[PDB]
Amino acid sequence: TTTVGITLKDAVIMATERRVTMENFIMHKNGKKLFQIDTYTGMTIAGLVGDAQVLVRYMKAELELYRLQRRVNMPIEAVATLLSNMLNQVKYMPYMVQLLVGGIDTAPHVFSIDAAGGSVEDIYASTGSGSPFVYGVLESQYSEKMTVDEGVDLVIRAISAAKQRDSASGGMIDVAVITRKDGYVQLPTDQIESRIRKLGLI
Amino acid sequence: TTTVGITLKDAVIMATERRVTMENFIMHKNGKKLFQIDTYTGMTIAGLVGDAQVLVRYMKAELELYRLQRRVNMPIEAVATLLSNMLNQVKYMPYMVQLLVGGIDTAPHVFSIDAAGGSVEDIYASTGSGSPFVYGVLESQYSEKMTVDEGVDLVIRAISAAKQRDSASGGMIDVAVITRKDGYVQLPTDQIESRIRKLGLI
Amino acid sequence: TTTVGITLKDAVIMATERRVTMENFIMHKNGKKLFQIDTYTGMTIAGLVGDAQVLVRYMKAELELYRLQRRVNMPIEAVATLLSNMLNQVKYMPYMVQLLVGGIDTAPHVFSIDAAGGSVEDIYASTGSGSPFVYGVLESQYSEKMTVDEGVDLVIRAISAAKQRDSASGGMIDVAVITRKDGYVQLPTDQIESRIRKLGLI
Amino acid sequence: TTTVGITLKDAVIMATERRVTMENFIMHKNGKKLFQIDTYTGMTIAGLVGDAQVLVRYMKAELELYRLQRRVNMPIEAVATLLSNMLNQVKYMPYMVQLLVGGIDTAPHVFSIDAAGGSVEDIYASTGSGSPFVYGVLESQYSEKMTVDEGVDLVIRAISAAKQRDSASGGMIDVAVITRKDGYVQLPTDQIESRIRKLGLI
Amino acid sequence: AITVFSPDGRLFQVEYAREAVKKGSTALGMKFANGVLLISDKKVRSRLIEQNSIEKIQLIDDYVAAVTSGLVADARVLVDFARISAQQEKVTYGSLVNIENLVKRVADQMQQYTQYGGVRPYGVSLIFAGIDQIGPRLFDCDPAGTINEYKATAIGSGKDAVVSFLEREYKENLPEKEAVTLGIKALKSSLEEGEELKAPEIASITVGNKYRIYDQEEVKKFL
Amino acid sequence: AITVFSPDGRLFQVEYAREAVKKGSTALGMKFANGVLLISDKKVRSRLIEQNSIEKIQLIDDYVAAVTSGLVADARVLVDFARISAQQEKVTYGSLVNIENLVKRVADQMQQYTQYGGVRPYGVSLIFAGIDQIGPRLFDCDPAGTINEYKATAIGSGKDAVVSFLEREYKENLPEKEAVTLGIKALKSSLEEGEELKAPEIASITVGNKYRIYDQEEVKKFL
Amino acid sequence: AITVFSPDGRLFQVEYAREAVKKGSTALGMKFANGVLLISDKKVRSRLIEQNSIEKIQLIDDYVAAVTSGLVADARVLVDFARISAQQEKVTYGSLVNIENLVKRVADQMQQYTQYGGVRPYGVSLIFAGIDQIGPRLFDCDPAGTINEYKATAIGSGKDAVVSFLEREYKENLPEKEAVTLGIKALKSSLEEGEELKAPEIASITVGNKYRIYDQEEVKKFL
Amino acid sequence: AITVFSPDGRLFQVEYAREAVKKGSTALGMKFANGVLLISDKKVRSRLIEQNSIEKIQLIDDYVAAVTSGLVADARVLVDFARISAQQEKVTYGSLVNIENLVKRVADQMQQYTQYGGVRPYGVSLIFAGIDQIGPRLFDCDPAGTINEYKATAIGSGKDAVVSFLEREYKENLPEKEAVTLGIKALKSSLEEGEELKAPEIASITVGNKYRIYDQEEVKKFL
Amino acid sequence: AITVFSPDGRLFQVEYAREAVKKGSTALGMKFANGVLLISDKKVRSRLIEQNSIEKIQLIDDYVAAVTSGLVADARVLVDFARISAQQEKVTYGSLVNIENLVKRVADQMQQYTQYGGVRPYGVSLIFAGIDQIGPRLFDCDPAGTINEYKATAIGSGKDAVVSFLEREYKENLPEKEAVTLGIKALKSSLEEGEELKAPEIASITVGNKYRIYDQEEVKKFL
């Protein structure tokens, strides 16, 4: 698994691959690891599939109820805090997951949350077995001044590098762009493929 | 054990063999591993027999009650989601099973669900100890454009290959075809045998 | 221990030996392992004696109460299903037993149930440490067209073979014949002995 | 420990020795292992002393209450069944004992009950570490046609043989004779000694 | 609480439940030679009723049967309780030696509902009959939980008339056929003035055998 | 407690609940050749009502259906209870052999709410009809928990008139079409004086088949 | 709550329960030389009653017996409680040294039902008699839970008359036969005017022995 | 208990709660072409009130909305309950297929508070409207837990007048704009004599879309 | 239960609690430019009282304050509840985004005590004021659990007079000093005839800042 989230001037970009190992072989080449959980909030999952899917359902319900009861979206930091409390409360019987939460309330934000409820904000982050390869790409090429279009190309290149070296990763790359003006926009695969050819990644 | 489910244009085909190992020998050559759980929904089971049979009874009751209370059949994705919640809720005291759910609501669907509640939709899937042999056949011969008749021959060939190489599998092949026009139809064994001769599988 | 149950045209034949090992020696040469639990239903037990005897008492009470409350005998498949639920409910704190249930409701039936609640119907079955020797005899000599008299001789020969090779088995053979016309009939030992001489088994 | 119970025409004979090992040495040479628990019912104990003494107190209370509430003595088979249920109910947190129950209701009976609640009726039985030596004597010398006087001599000889070979056994032999005409009669030690001299056992 | 002592030491709610029993159908039981029998009056009301599942005589097991009178819904609850109680005894001991113990368990349940506030007393009377280790037994039980054992007894609306008839004509060790004949005469004596006597329910049991439910034709040859 | 015995041995709260049932809509059921049928009167009130989800006849499973009368909110609770009870039996045994057991579970729940203070009794009467191992069955159940089995019966406001009509004209082993025709005539006989009879709900089931809900046009060709 | 203090400091519900005891059958007990005896009046009502299982004198164990008066259903509950209490003491200690402790456990249960709302008080009086480590004992217990020890005492309807007779003629260390004779005379003195005295129940126990139930013929040679 | 049956079979506490609903503000809902709409009358009381958070129309989710009348505090509790119930269904199944199930969960809660003593019944009526797998739905629910489905319905003080207006002028498959216009006329017809009609709350939803809350200016162009 | 519906649909116990609130001290709150303020009348009673810990205005946190009227003991309980509720929200989410949610939690607690027997309703009215993500907020809450949002409102005995004064003279976006001056005039208008106005309690908060408690000298320069 390889997931990544980066922050730009007024946008958040999140991306994953799609390979789901089960029964110690490549059973599903087209899984889903990136989810929209609020109007301007997204989430990526790594680890146990069953635990992660349950958590996604819980977060969608809680955020939706919050927005109805309080007339505003839950702030991104509060989303991370709520997740941190739930995970820590069962730390000795834990959800074995690693999560990324990203979105926009008044500024872009990306949060990394571990199985024990530790939550840390960062300018960019990556999870899964392919993450170390991603950090190498981000360390040498990431820039805060990048445009949205440059950022999308960057995450695509980072995940492509991970797929070449981490056997647990593979499949088509999914990308989401979150802005206040346009909201949560899932990039259609046709542009993802077009960028892949343009970047020379075959 | 070998079970398989594939999706075609407007149909779902599911199939299993019948060998049930108990007390570390071939006690029952004529078990049942494929069940109809709703008007247009089917289910295959692999793993612990006792756990699987209990789950089959639970699913039949829940789906029947759902259809009475809400006047429509439960959608296939909701069937998978309900199963995912139940399995995950006891993940540390689990049902040691692997399940396939297939059916038609407005389009054909096949879902694979593991013991921890991980649920993933796929165009085709296979479970049990004979599954790797099945995936080899499906990878080289499956086509989305196949007719129903071609699909039935394909799953029969795939399971026959597994029976030649997986000692835990054996016995007569059961096949079910699910369509909106005809519903859940269990193919009579006479046609299964006739196809086996026609395909040269003795 | 050696128990066996077979189905014929309109009859069920069940049989056991009588040796009960306790304190790692042959303490009781004349135990009881075959029980009538309903008007047309029988049960054999293998495994832990204490667990099995408790289960026999539970089944007699439940079936008797069922017949009083609903004015008809519980169908054989429902008997197996009830047993399957009880065993599976305590699968992690289990009754360490292997059971055979046989009887007649509208057709003869024999069911094999394991400690985890797995229940499978079969034309014939055998449990206990002497069972593999029994399956060899049944595989080579059983026929669905046998008369009741032929079937009784068959189970006697099968158990006698097990007693020659399984040290955990021994003692006199008990046989029960279940038909709709005559009900549950325990063959008197005098005919069992007479058949043993006639078959050349000394 | 060595205990024994045998059945004759219209009598039950039970007998034990008296050595109680505690703190891994012969602390008490004059223990009590044979108890009257009803008007025509007796009980012997082997295993953990504390567990056995608690069980003896429970059985005396239950049988006494039963006889007051129902105006008749509890039948011997029901005594064994009640014990079997209590032991099995705590099978995973068990009383580590082996018990013999004997008595007369309309015929003599002897029952052997293990720690897991397994209960088996037998013509004779023996428990404790000296039991295998007793079974050798009983196998070669027991006869169903023996008079009461012959039976008392037999159990005395059997226990004396065990005391010569099992270091855990020793002390004076206690004997009880149960008949309908005379009830539960504990033989005075003076006759036990007299028989021991007469039988040449010094 | 509802069931409290009156100034003269009476429990009015218990007394009122006894009035409810007085409205129930009439049933009777008597001991005969090596056995006991039960009779319940099956008054016909409408053709539209399925007169096969009335089952006034209910089996508790193969050797114990009961008949009830009063609030029919409360009676069904108590019969169910008796069946479960009987099965529990068989599981624990392997057999049922004394029917009196089973009756006391039922009557203890009924007594409980007369002492604790928040519940009302069962409006039922029952007759239990069967064979146990002591032999043929015949008990009744009232809403208060009072138990008695009889050679012959009756419950229901016609209880007073039937008992008076039995008080003068009942004999001991009567053969089954003659005892059944005597039972019909007692039942006919309590009939509403010149009303006709429709086919009632008959059950009997004999030492060594299970309960027998009389067939319709067999009952027909008794009127 | 609220439901207590009156001096004459009656439970007033149970009686009053029976009055609530007397205000409910009229429904009926009868057995025909190898089957059973249910009819419920669907009185039209306003055009503004969505006359598709009225569903007076409710399926408990594919082979068991019910109709209720009285407090509609209490009726919905009991129907839900019956459906869950039916599914529990199927899970435990793998099938439903006798519908009578399911009815008793429902009636036991209703009986409980007449004996314990702090709750009031359900103001509902129900009719259960279906096919089981014994064949076609037809029961009703009252607020007290009383159960009876019928060849034909009715509930609701017009129950007395419909039963009297059935008491004179009902026949056994009638074909489905003729039985349905007879049912309409009984329903029309209880109509308020010269009121017209609007399209009611019809359901039927035959041995070997599942329940059938009559379509509007099929019902239309019966008036 | 029901049992509350009256303005003059009395508990009316307790007083009313005492009236219920006044309607019960008459029983008596007295100490004799190295022992104690119990007598209960067995009034015959009907031939149809099985006069073998009346058992007015109930054994708590082999050395303790009781007789009760008042609400018979409540009495059966308390006797059962006493038997279980006695067995619990034997399990814990291995023996029963003082019967007074057993009586207090029973009377504490009865006292509890006079202080807490939601329940009513037991309408029973009891007499306990037996042999313990101190010797022959004789107690009674009333609905309030009051305990007293006597050389001789009586309960039931005829208690006042029997006690007055004992108040003038009772002696100590009387032989068993003479003590039993004295008991019959006291019982006969309370008889309804010129009513005859039917065969009562007699039980006795002597130091070193278990309880003895007098046979019918033995009782017959006392009238 | 408080809610008990009256002699004529009525629950007075339920009836009285219906009077409380009669004092609430008037609200209405109707189905139009491929959708459903809700209108609630926002009577102005004081300038000092913040007329932005009145929110008479409450969203249960993006596709389900409700309006209530009666005790406002009880109404808030039930709306909260509905929102939690809706989220539970989505968690278990992944979607909400039939709004009717959600309404029944709310009405079952309300029915419970009419049968068990120690609580009083909710004094609220509700209207639920939204889109599910079956299409546009419109239900109401009363304090007793009664549910009905409508093409158009109203609640509150002016319910009788609004329904009568809809009973004569309502049409099916009306366009959104015309349906909204018809709704205002019905609302204006129930107005207190010559009172003016202030800006009410409007919400609507169309198949394939989420709920829409009408803006103040949009509502302004309807008076 | 105590709080039940009257025949006209009213809850008398809730109404009576409103009378208790009418006896409490007068308090008021109003919104001003980028902020909100609270005023409570501190009537002097005795010199012997420590007039420092009166603290009519209680902080819920640094950004939320409340004033209460009615039963002072009940008011202290509800204020404590609000503080714990506020801290729970901050722990779960890290912040408090909408004060309205906190008020609803308090009002839900108060609503609960009007529906379940065995408890009585809180005799308190409260005003909550503070700054959240939406800006300056001002709510009140009554014993029934009714919530409203205002530009300006008052509670207590003089509520009717103060509101009428605000109904004519209140303006929006007033500077802090002028708004405070207006508040004193409203408070003085409700004074008992020619009674003098003693130094009250003043608190205010402005967007970006925490709550401010006015010092005694600052309040002194307002009379």
Residue numbers in the entry:
A (entry chain b), B (entry chain V), C (entry chain W), D (entry chain X): 1 to 202
E (entry chain Q), F (entry chain P), G (entry chain R), H (entry chain O), I (entry chain U): 11 to 233
Sentences from the paper on this structure:
The ubiquitin-proteasome system (UPS) is a crucial regulatory pathway responsible for eliminating damaged or unnecessary proteins within cells. Central to this system is the proteasome, a molecular machine that selectively degrades proteins.
In addition, our WT map also resolves the N-termini up to Ala11, which includes 2 additional residues not previously resolved in the closed state. Our cryo-EM structure of the WT T20S now resolves more of the N-termini in the closed state, showing clear density beyond the prior resolved T13 to also show the location of I12 and A11. In this T20S model, the T13 side chain occupies the space between Helices 0 and 2 and I12 is seen binding to a hydrophobic pocket created by the neighboring subunits N-termini comprising A11, I12, and V14. Prior studies suggest the N-termini of the closed state in the T20S are disordered, but our WT structure shows a high degree of order up to residue 11 with residues 1-10 being disordered, though still occupying the central channel. For example, in the closed state, I12 is bound to the neighboring N-termini’s hydrophobic pocket, and T13 is bound under Helix 0; then in the open state I12 binds under Helix 0 and T13 binds near V129/R130 in the other neighboring subunit.
